[PDB]
Design a protein around this ligand. Sequence first.
Ligand SMILES: OC[C@H]1O[C@@](CO)(OC[C@H]2O[C@](O)(CO)[C@@H](O)[C@@H]2O)[C@@H](O)[C@@H]1O
Ligand code: NA
Ligand code: NA
Length: 165
Amino acid sequence: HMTTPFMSNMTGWTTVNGTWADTIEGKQGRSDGDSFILSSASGSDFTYESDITIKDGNGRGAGALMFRSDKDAKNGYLANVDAKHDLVKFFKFENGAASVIAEYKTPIDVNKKYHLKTEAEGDRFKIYLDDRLVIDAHDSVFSEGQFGLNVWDATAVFQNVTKES
Ligand SMILES: OC[C@H]1O[C@@](CO)(OC[C@H]2O[C@](O)(CO)[C@@H](O)[C@@H]2O)[C@@H](O)[C@@H]1O
Ligand code: NA
Ligand code: NA
């Protein structure tokens, strides 16, 4: 029977762009720019988390959780680990244009598993890196939408991708 090594409680994964696959390590994405995959799962308030490992390829950029997204990932929130810029970023896309909401600055590495967790509750967003709170910010732009994953100028692997509402 069909099985995948990607572990998640979410289904319906639809590739927006980039190169996305399920490998023995998890769901891998790669692109030089931003690229996105969206689950059919949707929500408003939730805990959304994943293991994220940035690999050697492309520009050793970033891997991200995306949430409260529209169908083509043009509008939504992201929380990432960015090895190139050494930060955890909470940001939004509005009609395909990015703007930063909050950051935590820390050295971020390639070939190191990170655990990233977002708790989205109304207009408040708490982001944890390896179980430590690093961002606790407010933003009112988006209230609901799809869950997904992103990479920016990176190859990255996502494993144990889960949401709880
Ligand atoms: O952290 C990666 C994440 O950063 C974004 C949004 O800040 O921008 C990437 C990169 O693009 C520019 O805006 C210009 O090319 C730079 O200022 C920034 O380093 C997202 O696009 C990406 O997912
Ligand atoms: Na599954
Ligand atoms: Na780095």
